[PDB]
């Protein structure tokens, strides 16, 4: 997924808490998205 | 009727027809008839020969490379039923390499008790598809017919049909034997008991054909048994059954057994009496009595040894196995080799299975139709004295459908010596071979490469362990999956999950298309899970998972899987309404037609349609409608990734129109519309209405109503005012309700006895000049007619204005 | 300048780390400040960085709450050099709340880049800023979604932007507006003073702005001068860190040597590198699982480690890999499902194997199934320095390739018993190396047949027809059956009949691309009993040429009344090397319908111009044959044309003005022997009209009659723009208006001009203009006559 | 030369021809014709022995 | 692909040998160059 619609993916997987190069260009790896969660945000 | 004539024990005819006269005076044959290998024969030679006597053949009929023959009908016009007790390579009737054979001609054959028909490589035969083997046999699928004249070429099977025709696959076709003979069909109620010409049922015990309906005495064949012409279902004493078709008095079997014993024939059998049956030899658990030919049961455990020639036998067809029927001890080895394509397990377990012990080895090579060796019912021990080369006792190779080895829930086994061998068994499981290894007791006799670790069951599903879907989340096009992490005893053995899925419109789904996703095993919490992608909304899908392990042969870890799981996505905004058309069938009635959206995206609740009325063009009120051209119309990072990597850096890795609700309707009628006027209409399919109604894009369309008639015509009289200079200013109320609007008024004014002139009063001419004016008119009677041209067209000319100036 | 080096850094989640910027003057980097949510205005009126002057790379702000004016925090920030442009931009400030004004009165210029301002509901005072005075380029700005859009030049209500004189284009204007030094930029403490320059136009050097960097000081990031000592120190600092390994070249501390250049251990200079010599990559072990793992391998050429590849499944790896040329350690392939061959490693010719796989192995292969080939060992060269080879469970690699392995690598004695297994390799690989000879071929422009020598296994029944493989061959070389886990259009053949003379199998193709190169081979098909297949060499055949296609896009322009310039594009199907184009042109007669239409009346407008089953079926047939045979027999006890050569354009001269011309264009790929020329391409083009063609040439002759009737005779412009539809006449009498008349072609014909009757007494005039296809010409001279 | 079924019969009735083929009684020994002429090439004598009278 | 269009192929396969008409083995069935070999008679 590319810019903007990967925001939906991060909304889903991250829940209540490099980018685009990984999903628009590379394969969206899921587990990569999980550790991206900004718990201390 | 009875069976006049002899019984003609089975024979063969070779190298000339002069031997055929052996069939002179017999109507039945004990055994098999082989006509084959005719070279110096021609059709005129065959035309003389005939045998109306023959009725039923015991074992089989075989024709192989008989020259000069074209149609068998003149030879065997009365063969009715083929018993087929002892087949010829699992085939009851073989028609092979018939040159010149144009047509079969067996219009009296009815049933074949057990067997199949194989006709091939003749390149001279047609009238093939015009016959129905279903009414002839019981197992049609076992038939094998290829390489004829009928198939590759198009030999016309011209035959009357006059004769019955019936469906075979999806269409009717005549069922004809010859150009003058056709298959005898009759109601299925008397399925095999026979049926006369008028359709009346034959006797219950009867079979095929009969002269007197429902009369055992006057039949030609009966399915049960034969005795003294009037055959009976089960004859009483002192008649013992024989060759499963006729029973004889004890004296007959007695004298024939004596004829076999005194004349030491290498083929004759010392017949015995057992359960009132003069069979060639009664099985294990019985002993021949010299006094009376009954074989009394033995007072001991002596099995019937079944010694093998050259210590080895090959089982490839039914006739190969039937030699071993009743045998229970084999002083040799066994090589199952069934080059098939159709199942044979039935007759194999019927004839085999009674075997218990194998002196030599066993080997199952190249078999294809075998699904499980369970048909070896009572096999218990494999002594393996005749050890196969490579010091092997049990063997296997290239068995494409070998599913199950044995039912280990209840079946014992024992292997004395020798080691195993398994290779190229794509439908097996290492679980099954390991279970056999444990049961066998040869567990310490296993060595490397005796059991291939990959070819055994390439594509099966026997991981024997279950997985649980820990969490599920649904959405439009994203489905989040999560399951319990799996960990074999050594985590290095686990190598990754495979998630298989496929869209499932229904509930009938198999196991084992089927799109795959690879999942990296997690690092030892942390449920592996996976997130879905690319879904179509409101659609059901079947999903399951699978584990992958290493060879793991020393242990018994086989991975796991999940059960087949159904789950469907959600509904969303539907697609555009389809086929939007609008036709005004009346001046105020418009029909609107549309089709459901190509993507309903859920159960379409309704359609939402709005409409309104446009306004006429302003320029249409200030146009000169009598100048030239007066024709009035009738109706790659770039900017896109700029913000993307902006979000990347920011986020950073962490260390009112009239309307209604049209329900269940694709056609609308709209009334109360201004005649000949355009209207704007839109429509939106709606798959969700009550909960915050969700509708698709508007279905834009526009349509103008049918014009009226009086609207164009001028309403109101014509008034004139004449000045002193003979100038006539003309008044007439316009049709204030025209078809849309009026662009001009044509004024046709004439003199008395003179020509008629046309003048244009456009909208600006009528309004700005406040009517119209005529200048330069000489005195005399006049006649002025006015016609209004509206958007639709022209009106009616007014009455002629009679006046003098 | 009193301050710190100040490398670029970022601040998020709070304003605490912002205090670190207290002791800084000039930023050698970029500032990216964002994630300010618990931020209120009152907490930002007490902080300021007057010492901060210049930002080297760029500035980004995002999600800013509380801030309303940056004049406080950044009062004395002067110039953003934009040494590292943020995607051709130097300033991106996005999604602010409460931020109403700019406040950066001390910004005068930006060396390079532009600005991006978007989604700012509060920002105002945008109409009082001159971007042209500040930034030399104003076409790249993008300022949308602000408060101003939802003249005095002033930053804030109390700060003016100030306008330098046009003479001070880049020197800067001082308090009196006097131009500053050439090296001065934006502003200066004293006019025409390099020492007093507020900003350095080209380079900075110890408080003095200079144009260049004298040696040994090299141009550091095109903004300052740094000697070899500090540049090498930064090089070493990156050397022992995670990076921009600095190297000196052309008196510039570039973060890497460019193409064809290499840094030397003696000196950071980028000496001209030898040929490609791209790089060396380091690890000692790395595995590749899929495309992603091999992504960073791009550009890796010499590997100072070992490679263990396991691809759980093609051309994607061919893109990722294939740039590898040597491996220091041992190579292993393990359980790569989606691997068919090793053709990707084009340049692998020597391996050192100093590190040895367990068991002292140099090349390890285990549990790989779909492997079919390794390389073109006929031409590919491979060397092994030392080690051992392991081949096990490789079912689809027949032993001929394994034999060629050591004979090419020179490891004949390096391998030991059981190093290469016999029964676990090439089980499905059924290479039988029986050669098929092609009888002959012959080619037509559209089609081609194919016949080859016969072949029969020992049991002639065992042969089950031939497979024929073909596709297009761009160049003279191509692989065989590689594809993926594969294009190669295939067609089956039935076996030929036994002639017990000998027929040939043969086959004719069906459809193809004319004048193209095809690669074809034929493979046998026989059921295993042993395996007695066969295969043929990859044969390249060239389909003969034919007539080409039509040249594309014929366009014609009337650059002159006689010159027509033609252009087109090469035909879609060249079908041979195009010898030339054939061009024909012919004058198109104008529409004669004008000659009978009286255009003087209404209508004055004038236009101007899957397989196991059948194998088993054969086996079934054969085994029944054998059973029958065994049981039966028992032994005893023309147009003006042009040959346009190597040109896609043309020009045609000698053409009349405003004249249509039909143009016919073919392409001929053949020149001397009856040129193959395609069908025509047709286009009509009209030259531009002459300006004087429609103007009437000839004085007007008039004949006054007794009853005041005038007979007007005038000479038409015999060479008009095509023709003259009508003549417009403006005749005026003394004391009267200019009455108008229209003389049609028929009117000029039968009346010999005009015949006007009933003329009022007085002096008339006669002005006549011709209306040709181009338009009205010139009015005639007024003929004054007193009637 | 090696020959197998189909053409094997055509090879017969020419080398043997005329008179028929010997056939007494079944009396399957895994050596009949296929593993002697189709599996492995055979001479004329191995075929001549399959004639009836000589 | 049968009568009318294939005549060129008929000249193609055999050249200067000549054939006799019949085609319904190729616009319903298939051409395999065997029947193309046969129909063109010497």
Residue numbers in the entry:
A (entry chain E): 8 to 24, 41 to 64
B (entry chain B): 1 to 161, 168 to 518, 528 to 539, 546 to 656, 699 to 718, 768 to 917
C (entry chain A): 3 to 152, 179 to 270, 274 to 314, 317 to 346, 351 to 522, 527 to 541, 545 to 573, 577 to 656, ...
D (entry chain D): 6 to 32, 37 to 63
E (entry chain C): 8 to 29, 43 to 62
Sentences from the paper on this structure:
Insulin receptor (IR) is a receptor tyrosine kinase that plays critical roles in cellular signaling, growth, and metabolism. IR can be activated by two highly related ligands – insulin and insulin-like growth factor 2 (IGF2). Here, we present cryo-EM structures of full-length human long isoform IR (IR-B) in both the inactive and IGF2-bound active states, and short isoform IR (IR-A) in the IGF2-bound active state.
In one half of the asymmetric IR/IGF2 complex, the two IGF2 molecules bind to site-1’ in the head of Ƭ-shape and site-2’ in the middle regions of the receptor. In the other half of the asymmetric complex, the third IGF2, located in the middle region of the Ƭ-shaped structure, is sandwiched between site-1 and site-2’ from two adjacent IR protomers. This asymmetric IR/IGF2 complex exhibits similar architecture to the recently reported cryo-EM structure of IR/insulin complex at subsaturated insulin concentrations. Hence, it is reasonable to speculate that the predominant adoption of asymmetric conformations of IR in response to saturated IGF2 (about 84% and 86% of total particles for IR-A and IR-B, respectively) might result from the comparatively weaker binding of IGF2 at IR site-2. In the asymmetric state, one IGF2 is simultaneously contacting site-1 and site-2’ from two protomers, similar to the IR/insulin complex at subsaturated insulin concentrations. Therefore, it is likely that IGF2’s lower efficiency in promoting the T-shaped IR is due to its comparatively weak IR site-2 binding affinity. In addition, the 12-residue extension in the C-terminus of α-CT, the unique structural element that only exists in IR-B, was not resolved in the cryo-EM map of IR-B/IGF2 complex, suggesting that this structural element is not involved in the ligand binding or stabilizing the active conformation of IR.
